[PDB]
Amino acid sequence: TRIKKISIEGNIAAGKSTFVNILKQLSEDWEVVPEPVARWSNVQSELTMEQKNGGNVLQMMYEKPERWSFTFQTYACLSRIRAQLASLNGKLKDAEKPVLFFERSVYSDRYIFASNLYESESMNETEWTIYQDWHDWMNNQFGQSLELDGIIYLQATPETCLHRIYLRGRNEEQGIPLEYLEKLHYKHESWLLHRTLKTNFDYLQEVPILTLDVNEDFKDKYESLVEKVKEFLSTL
Amino acid sequence: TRIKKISIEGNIAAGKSTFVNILKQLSEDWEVVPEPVARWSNVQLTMEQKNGGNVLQMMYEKPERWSFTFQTYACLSRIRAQLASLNGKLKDAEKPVLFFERSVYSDRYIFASNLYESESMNETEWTIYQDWHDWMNNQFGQSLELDGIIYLQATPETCLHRIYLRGRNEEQGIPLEYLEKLHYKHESWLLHRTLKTNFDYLQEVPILTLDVNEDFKDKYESLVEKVKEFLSTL
Numbered sequence: 001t002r003i004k005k006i007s008i009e010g011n012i013a014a015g016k017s018t019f020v021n022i023l024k025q026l027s028e029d030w031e032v033v034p035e036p037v038a039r040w041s042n043v044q045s046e047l048t049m050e051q052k053n054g055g056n057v058l059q060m061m062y063e064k065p066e067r068w069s070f071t072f073q074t075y076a077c078l079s080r081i082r083a084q085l086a087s088l089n090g091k092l093k094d095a096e097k098p099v100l101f102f103e104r105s106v107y108s109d110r111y112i113f114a115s116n117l118y119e120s121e122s123m124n125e126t127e128w129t130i131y132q133d134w135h136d137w138m139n140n141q142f143g144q145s146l147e148l149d150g151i152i153y154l155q156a157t158p159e160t161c162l163h164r165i166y167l168r169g170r171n172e173e174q175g176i177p178l179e180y181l182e183k184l185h186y187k188h189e190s191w192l193l194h195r196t197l198k199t200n201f202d203y204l205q206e207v208p209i210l211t212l213d214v215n216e217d218f219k220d221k222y223e224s225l226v227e228k229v230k231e232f233l234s235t236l
Numbered sequence: 237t238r239i240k241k242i243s244i245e246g247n248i249a250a251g252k253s254t255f256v257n258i259l260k261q262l263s264e265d266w267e268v269v270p271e272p273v274a275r276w277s278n279v280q281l282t283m284e285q286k287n288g289g290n291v292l293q294m295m296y297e298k299p300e301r302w303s304f305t306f307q308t309y310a311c312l313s314r315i316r317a318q319l320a321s322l323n324g325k326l327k328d329a330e331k332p333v334l335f336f337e338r339s340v341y342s343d344r345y346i347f348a349s350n351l352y353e354s355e356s357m358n359e360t361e362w363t364i365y366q367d368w369h370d371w372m373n374n375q376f377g378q379s380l381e382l383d384g385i386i387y388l389q390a391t392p393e394t395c396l397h398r399i400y401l402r403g404r405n406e407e408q409g410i411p412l413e414y415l416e417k418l419h420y421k422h423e424s425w426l427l428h429r430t431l432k433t434n435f436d437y438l439q440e441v442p443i444l445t446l447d448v449n450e451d452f453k454d455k456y457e458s459l460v461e462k463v464k465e466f467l468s469t470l
């Protein structure tokens with residue numbers, strides 16, 4: 001596909017949806033696929049069978065993670081794979097220099113969230129190794145159109161995020177302690193900064209990573225961030 | 237797709253594997269795909285084998301907890317078993333037929349549906365499972381789609397005895413009642429054809445019913461004759 005594919009990765013409330021809502025408008029050639037679990041959260045302040053399903057298991061994961069982590073992760077990834085295909089197959093067709101920016105990836109579902117829940121014992125060996133087998137298979141069967149051209153890592157401190165959950169307003173999330181935000185932080189850092197983490201995805205070894213410090217608020221001062229995105233994107 | 241795909245359907249211990257192993261022996265153009273979960277029973281470690289054994293045991297031990305997880309893995313493991321057979325087997329055959337031991341419709345419309353009606357999957361699990369199943373078999377289900385179905389009809393009392401003959405520890409506690417629920421879903425789907433389903437083609441798929449209440453391991457010729465006759469109609 002002539003479409004280049006870049007994932008925007010970062011801790012809970014790093015500012016990914018913000019950044020991507022900024023990039024979409026800066027080129028008719030730039031397009032966005034939001035995270036489907038991003039839409040499962042907010043209140044009944046909308047219809048949808050995926051969202052009712054997502055609404056339900058998300059909330060169920062908050063109340064009993066060790067009962068619902070596998071079902072959640074399973075469905076979150078399905079939902080992401082489906083939605084990524086639809087944008088690939090739907091958007092950017094008349095674009096000269098098309099860039100599709102993914103709000104996270106199949107790989108954050110696995111090596112961030114799913115890996116953490118297992119290590120946090122909310123998944124047993126069986127649940128985790130089934131999910132990993134299911135994830136290898138789901139992604140080597142469909143997800144082949146989705147292999148990433150590069151990755152943008154929005155790096156913020158666990159403490160910035162806490163504040164941005166602070167500043168965001170979602171009830172469920174106000175109860176995420178720093179220690180959990182800290183855990184995902186370390187895992188992003190080992191996956192993306194150090195590039196220690198091996199993945200069962202060979203080409204990942206060689207995908208370009210762009211790391212951007214997002215601690216400073218970028219709503220009214222994003223031009224240098226985008227300048228680095230634009231340069232990153234030319235090497236691709 | 238010149239390989240004809242036929243599923244063999246029926247209850248636990250009706251005689252599905254026996255009949256499948258009989259069939260395979262009779263022709264060079266005939267190949268079988270044995271059902272995954274059947275292999276997850278025995279010790280007698282592959283990753284699948286390992287997760288599989290574990291999750292069946294957990295399933296037995298607590299079905300309200302483990303049913304969704306079991307049903308996704310079963311079905312996933314079955315799709316990949318059938319996909320591998322189809323791109324592997326019967327390349328030189330002149331009249332190729334691959335017989336599936338069960339299928340993804342029985343995964344969903346007998347077993348998963350039965351667990352839903354048993355309160356072993358709550359509503360969102362059943363809904364999520366249906367969504368995942370629909371998506372894939374509308375993505376991939378393609379080259380797996382069936383040419384016909386062969387239904388091995390046994391009474392629940394026949395299966396109970398056969399379960400006991402087959403001597404799997406696990407299965408010894410399967411009550412007639414559960415067998416009788418499974419029986420009704422088969423009669424329902426495969427004989428009376430009243431069951432409704434998200435795969436429209438299955439409405440016009442031909443079905444051969446075979447009564448396997450009699451032992452056939454040494455007296456199967458009439459069973460096989462009906463199969464050949466069926467195969468020529470498709």
Ligand SMILES: O=c1ccn([C@@H]2O[C@H](COP(=O)(O)OP(=O)(O)O)[C@@H](O)[C@H]2O)c(=O)[nH]1
Pocket residue numbers: 010011012013014015016017018019164165167168214216217218219
């Ligand atoms: O530079 C920034 C980045 C984000 N935010 C705010 O921080 C919260 C979390 O951002 P976002 O919704 O983008 O979170 P993410 O998508 O990463 O989870 C939101 O209320 C944003 O308005 C902000 O004020 N300045």
Ligand SMILES: O=c1ccn([C@@H]2O[C@H](COP(=O)(O)OP(=O)(O)O)[C@@H](O)[C@H]2O)c(=O)[nH]1
Pocket residue numbers: 246247248249250251252253254255398399401402403450451452453
């Ligand atoms: O005509 C038959 C068919 C089956 N069996 C036995 O009944 C048990 C159940 O058969 P099978 O495993 O093939 O049933 P499936 O579970 O595959 O439907 C096994 O011990 C078979 O050897 C039998 O005695 N006579």
Ligand SMILES: Nc1nc(=O)n([C@H]2C[C@H](O)[C@@H](CO)O2)cc1Br
Pocket residue numbers: 012035037038041073076077104108109110113114173
């Ligand atoms: N694959 C995923 N697993 C999760 O547990 N979350 C959680 C973290 C956070 O509480 C919320 C994201 O809005 O869901 C998200 C994704 Br994406």
Ligand SMILES: Nc1nc(=O)n([C@H]2C[C@H](O)[C@@H](CO)O2)cc1Br
Pocket residue numbers: 248271273274307310338342343344347348410
């Ligand atoms: N899709 C399935 N779901 C099940 O619960 N089983 C059960 C039937 C029996 O109780 C045990 C051994 O096959 O697993 C089988 C299949 Br196939």
